[PDB]
Amino acid sequence: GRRRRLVWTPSQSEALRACFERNPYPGIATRERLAQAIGIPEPRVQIWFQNERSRQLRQHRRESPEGRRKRTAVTGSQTALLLRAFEKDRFPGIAAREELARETGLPESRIQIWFQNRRARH
């Protein structure tokens, strides 16, 4: 069970490509500003820039420093809750992550990263 896939409007597509053309490695500030200007949540914008670099790099292989997101602070209380969840299921779907986001107060996009990191190291 994954998040429902959105569909770019023509005006959104134009804005993402034009910003990608100026810098394919935007920082959190550029992603946030672009996300608000076009009405899309920032994680979807980040996912698009990653997919779009994948398209461009694979295409160029057949032809040819902006600031990061601030480190999310995770309390021991939040960590213990995600830990207990991680033991029952290491691959929570969108609904289980929204649950964990609700119970922890952390954004769901950070829960997704937390599980990606945890599975690679534990």
Partner DNA sequence: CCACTAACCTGATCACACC
Partner DNA sequence: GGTGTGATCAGGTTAGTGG
The residues binding DNA (CB under 7 A) are 2-8, 25, 27-28, 44, 46-55, 57-58, 65, 68-72, 74, 79, 91, 94, 110, 112-121
CB of 46 to DNA, least distance (A): 6
Crossing angle of helices 28-38 and 10-22, in 10° steps, is 160
CB of 96 to DNA, least distance (A): 10
112, 97 Cβ separation under 8 angstroms = yes
109, 115 Cβ separation under 8 angstroms = no
CA-to-CA distance for 112 and 116, rounded, in angstroms? 6
CB of 84 to DNA, least distance (A): 15
